[PDB]
């Protein structure tokens, strides 16, 4: 209506290219680095405190 701007259209193969390209950016390396850091911090704290 009015301005010919449809709300949505069916997917196109050219648009399918970008749809296949779109992905959620990963945190696996970040999460594993954080886990290793906190684990080694705990291990250090195990004997760090004065007896």
């Amino acid at each position: 209506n009015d301005n010919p701007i449809p709300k949505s259209v069916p997917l196109h193969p050219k648009s399918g290219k970008y749809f296949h390209n779109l992905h959620a950016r990963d945190l696996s390396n970040i999460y594993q680095q954080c886990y290793k850091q906190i684990d080694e911090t705990i291990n250090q704290l195990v004997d760090s405190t004065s007896p």
Binding site: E40, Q44, S48
Partner: protein, 50 residues
């Protein structure tokens, strides 16, 4: 973490120096015992110097 490891190494060579000074003071106490052994014999000056 590296600085904490360095400070642990600091604590432990300080412990090594503590053991070394404990050895020094046990040696000093043995010297003190030898001093008492020397004290055992009186070496009194004569009663008639003057």
């Amino acid at each position: 973490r590296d600085e904490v490891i360095k400070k642990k190494n600091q604590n432990e060579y300080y412990r090594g120096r503590t053991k070394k000074l404990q050895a020094t003071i046990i040696s000093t106490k043995e010297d003190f015992l030898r001093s008492q052994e020397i004290l055992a014999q009186t070496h009194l000056p004569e009663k008639s110097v003057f």
